């Protein structure tokens, strides 16, 4: 009632089903700009926070109509059977055929990996492909031009390309904004808000549409929100709507105002409705005494309190260590 949130919306935030954004950080979803106190589903929060990266599977045996570094659009096909249902940059994934033309075809295997970019000039002795066994490692027989084909799949990421030749000043993971210098001492700058992923292989600083949106979940969001609320102000707004012709408008405004006035007259802060320190009842009032039979008997409160502690310290460790949000 105070935050003008529905009970469903509350549940969603507390039980982690939808994010509530506290600062939009220049977020545009479906064209419409994002606002504070806005409920985002998981899929949406991802697009805005991380990006749009879809890999289309290529049936092993067919080559690629697209090449590494190229860009594709919706209505355009990666291979005869596979098309891209989106626009953006497309990257080869697990090319099965490396054919360096020595100014020769080499087979790729699951564990094998490549360390050279497509169209790279090579000489005898350099490193082109690696593997678990160096006895099975591929080397550079002579001067030749690198070429990779037959990728397992194509990741069509909606991102932008920022090639560089000098050292980068951005490490993968960082977020960027239009004009943000990325590398080459000012020469390489950003063209859009996004997330950077320096590709040392292709010496390319990629940026994927993404902002530092603050869309939190749980009581932490509700607690901050409650703390941000100014009781005096909300009273005013509700009073002005208490002057609205509609009967229901004035009714709801009165009820909200009753809660606000309660907090104002009492002096209690709405944030106290969120709990960070839980009390524990004196153990005598919830004991585990020994019966005449010699056995002990405990109150259900004890098993409830312990259940919380088990979950709390589990979370503290997991958080302190750091691990997937999921």
């Amino acid at each position: 009632t105070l935050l003008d949130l529905s009970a469903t919306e509350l549940e969603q935030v507390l039980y982690f089903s939808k994010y509530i954004v506290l600062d939009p950080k220049g977020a545009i979803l479906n064209g419409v700009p994002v606002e504070k106190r806005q409920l985002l589903t998981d899929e949406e929060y991802r697009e805005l926070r991380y990006g749009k990266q879809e890999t289309y599977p290529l049936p092993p045996g067919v080559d690629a109509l697209v090449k590494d570094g190229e860009e594709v659009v919706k209505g355009q096909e990666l291979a005869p059977g596979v098309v891209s249902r989106l626009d953006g940059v497309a990257l080869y994934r697990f090319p099965r055929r490396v054919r360096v033309e020595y100014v020769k075809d080499y087979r790729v295997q699951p564990h094998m990996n490549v360390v050279v970019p497509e169209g790279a000039r090579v000489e005898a002795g350099d490193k082109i492909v690696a593997a678990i066994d160096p006895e099975e490692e591929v080397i550079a027989e002579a001067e030749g031009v690198v070429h990779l084909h037959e990728p397992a799949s194509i990741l069509v990421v909606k991102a932008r390309v920022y090639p560089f030749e000098d050292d980068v000043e951005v490490s993968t993971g960082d977020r960027v904004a239009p004009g943000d210098v990325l590398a080459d001492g000012g020469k390489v700058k950003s063209d859009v808000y996004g997330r950077v992923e320096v590709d040392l292989v292709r010496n390319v600083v990629r940026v994927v549409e993404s902002y530092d949106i603050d869309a939190r979940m749980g009581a932490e969001a509700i607690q901050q929100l409650l703390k941000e609320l100014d009781l005096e102000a909300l009273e005013k707004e509700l009073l002005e709507e208490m002057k609205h012709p509609s009967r229901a408008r004035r009714a709801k405004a009165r009820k909200r105002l009753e809660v606000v006035r309660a907090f104002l007259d009492s002096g209690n802060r709405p944030e106290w409705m969120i709990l960070e320190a839980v009390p524990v009842l004196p153990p005598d009032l919830r004991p585990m005494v020994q019966v005449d039979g010699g056995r002990f008997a405990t109150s259900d409160l004890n098993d409830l309190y312990r259940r919380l502690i088990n979950r709390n310290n589990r979370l503290k460790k997991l958080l302190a260590q750091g691990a997937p949000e999921i």
């Binding site: 990996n113 397992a152 980068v168 490490s171 977020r175 008997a297 997991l318």
Partner: protein, 338 residues
């Protein structure tokens, strides 16, 4: 949504399953990044954990709740390294990210593992949290050089974590896992007897079936330790109008009869000291510990009265005897002895 199970299922059900090529790439990238952390730690001279966390911190963001200016300050040093040195920083960032992906994706196995560890005193979800916890350590140690698919080496930490948790969070009274294990084999060997004997094992049968150093006494003893407390709120009668704690007394707290008798005893005992001089009584007060609860030795009492222990000891005897005479005319204090 109402069913948190289905919620985790959909949350991790959007994460695609990694193909051997994808798995090998990611797991490999993870390993490379961790070793890159080593090299970057050495070059920086910083604590390897700190730099691992500043890399991760950036990967996760300030969104995660070492003030953030620190991780920036470090990141400034990390980025003030030359091009070659920043290379390993970049790779380590990529590895921390691949770590996250590999975990997020290799979780459906954790479900398919914990579903058989249920009914052991912990719920599906509690167990899962434990299996995921161990999984992160397993991913941190998994090597693609072995060439065994992640499932193979992962299950070990997934089963160990849940099984350890069941032995750590299922008893109101914390009991060591090794003890739990003994108890488990006690029931295992017992049931074997029960099904073979066609009847019902005893302390002495299982004891011998268990092996050496195993007697009937030990069986019953172990069962006594295994005894679990019961709920005081347990229902009494078919009418749920009564509970266990209702029919359980208080033995600790002063019962009006007990407190009354103590008030009477101390009164009469004093009335007996009124039958002595304050020196005699005081001596007894300190010696017996009535003066201030603490009983004071004869040497201390002789330090108070400035008297040789022998004289203090003898007057204490004289005082006790005088009390005995007065008692031989009263015997009022004997009643309190009861």
């Amino acid at each position: 949504t109402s069913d948190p199970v289905r919620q985790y299922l959909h949350e991790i059900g959007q994460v695609p399953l990694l193909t051997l090529e994808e798995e090998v790439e990611l797991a490999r990238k993870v390993e490379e990044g961790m070793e890159a952390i080593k090299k970057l730690s050495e070059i920086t001279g910083l604590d390897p954990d700190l730099i691992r966390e500043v890399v991760r911190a950036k990967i996760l963001g300030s969104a995660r709740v070492l003030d953030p200016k620190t991780v920036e300050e470090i990141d400034q040093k990390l980025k003030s390294l030359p091009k070659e040195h920043k290379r390993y920083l970049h790779i380590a960032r990529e590895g921390e990210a691949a770590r996250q992906h590999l975990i997020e994706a290799n979780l459906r196995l954790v479900v398919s593992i914990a579903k058989k560890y249920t009914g052991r005193g912990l719920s599906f979800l509690d167990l899962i949290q434990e299996g995921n916890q161990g999984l992160i350590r397993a991913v941190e140690k998994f090597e693609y050089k072995r060439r065994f698919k992640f499932s193979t080496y992962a299950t070990w930490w997934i089963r160990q974590a849940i099984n350890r948790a069941i032995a750590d969070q299922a008893r109101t009274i914390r009991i060591p896992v090794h003890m739990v294990e003994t108890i488990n084999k006690l029931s295992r060997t017992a049931r074997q007897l029960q099904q073979e004997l066609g009847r019902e094992p005893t302390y002495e049968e299982i004891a011998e079936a268990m092996g050496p150093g195993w007697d009937a006494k030990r069986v019953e003893e172990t069962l006594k330790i295994a005894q679990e407390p019961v709920s005081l709120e347990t229902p009494i009668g078919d009418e749920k109008d009564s509970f266990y704690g209702d029919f359980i007394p208080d033995e600790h707290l002063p019962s009006p009869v007990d407190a009354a008798t103590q008030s009477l005893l101390s009164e009469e005992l004093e009335k007996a000291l009124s039958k002595l001089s304050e020196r005699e009584a005081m001596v007894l007060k300190l010696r017996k510990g009535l003066i201030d609860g603490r009983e004071h030795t004869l040497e201390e009492v002789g330090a108070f009265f400035g008297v040789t222990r022998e004289r203090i000891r003898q007057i204490e005897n004289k005082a006790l005897r005088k009390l005995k005479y007065h008692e031989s005319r009263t015997r009022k204090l004997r009643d309190f002895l009861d």
